[PDB]
Amino acid sequence: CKARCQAFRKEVILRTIKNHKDIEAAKKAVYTAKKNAEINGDLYAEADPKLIVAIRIRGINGVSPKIKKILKLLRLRQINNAVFIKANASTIKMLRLVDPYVTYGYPTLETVQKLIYKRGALKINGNRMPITSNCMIKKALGDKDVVCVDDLVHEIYTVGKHFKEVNNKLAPFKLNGAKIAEKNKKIHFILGGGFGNRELLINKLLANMI
């Protein structure tokens, strides 16, 4: 009857063990290679980031026709809507044409977790259903070998082979409000503004926005 629930939990525990290995083992090799390069006098070139988290900053009134379409393809159709974007030569260029309406950086694992645990949602049968179990995630994403929520958080973080399928399934998060800028949101973050690339300083803004 319900003896398969007991066995299912063990598989989720097994997957959480293995999922945390890839994240921790890849973190150790980055730090180990940083120590060996300092001792030998060599230089180290840190790898480029693979994930970009973009937040819509402005409203919907007064958007140029082409920029309006790029935001729709990024699923930033509302103010204070954060999504996870793959970084390559295309989306980086797309995220640059619409800069006055987005602020984006790179998320740490402590930020991917909070967004998905607190503001997570899935599109099942066309309804944006908030995440409340793993049997809901397994039913929607069973064929993508994503049966739990630490399989969903891991795939987003490391940008796996099934990232696009996972990414579109997650609905764009609806976030709170928080102080975006020092001067205002009409100038680049370089000049102490609101939009533009914030790199690892986006985690500070997402902490007050979740």
């Binding site: 230089l43 180290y44 070139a45 790898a47 390559n88 030569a89």
Partner: protein
């Protein structure tokens, strides 16, 4: 305010290329266009008979029908809010073989070369080859070491102003 002439505003659109006057080549009248080829229309002002409309200059079309002295070419023309199908008949002097599928037709050959090996490896039992990797935009570069034996440094600072007069 302009006029309604057929070839209006053609001081620089129909002007021949610099030091390109006179006769065209001999491969212009010798290339073989078969039905289904992608060719580019390029109006040639040296040959007036049959000059295509100036709005089709540079558009890319599909050869649909090859007539003894003219090559049928169909292109998409834009109207108020709909796209229509235009069916011209351009002499070979006014069109050029488009190489839009230059990249694509070399990917097909690479895949066909691999698939030819997979029908031999499978027959003889060897493990078949994997298909070529797909094209992706410029991916984020990984982390790579830099030796400290062939390195050199140049300090970078804002430059002191030097007057230009």
């Amino acid at each position: 305010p302009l006029s309604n002439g057929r070839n209006r505003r053609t001081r620089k659109l129909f002007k021949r290329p610099f030091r390109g006057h006179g006769l065209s080549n001999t491969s212009t009248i010798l290339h073989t266009y078969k039905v289904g080829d992608y060719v580019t229309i390029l109006c040639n002002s040296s040959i007036q008979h049959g000059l295509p409309y100036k709005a089709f200059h540079g558009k890319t079309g599909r050869v649909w029908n090859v007539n003894p002295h003219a090559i049928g070419v169909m292109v998409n023309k834009k109207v108020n809010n709909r796209i229509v199908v235009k069916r011209l008949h351009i002499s070979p002097e006014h069109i050029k073989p488009s190489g839009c599928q230059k990249d694509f037709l070399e990917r097909k050959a690479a895949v066909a070369a691999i698939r030819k090996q997979n029908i031999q490896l499978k027959k003889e039992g060897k493990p078949l080859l994997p298909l070529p990797a797909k094209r992706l935009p410029k991916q984020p570069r990984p982390a790579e070491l830099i030796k400290g034996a062939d390195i050199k440094f140049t300090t970078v600072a804002p430059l002191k102003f030097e007057e230009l007069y």
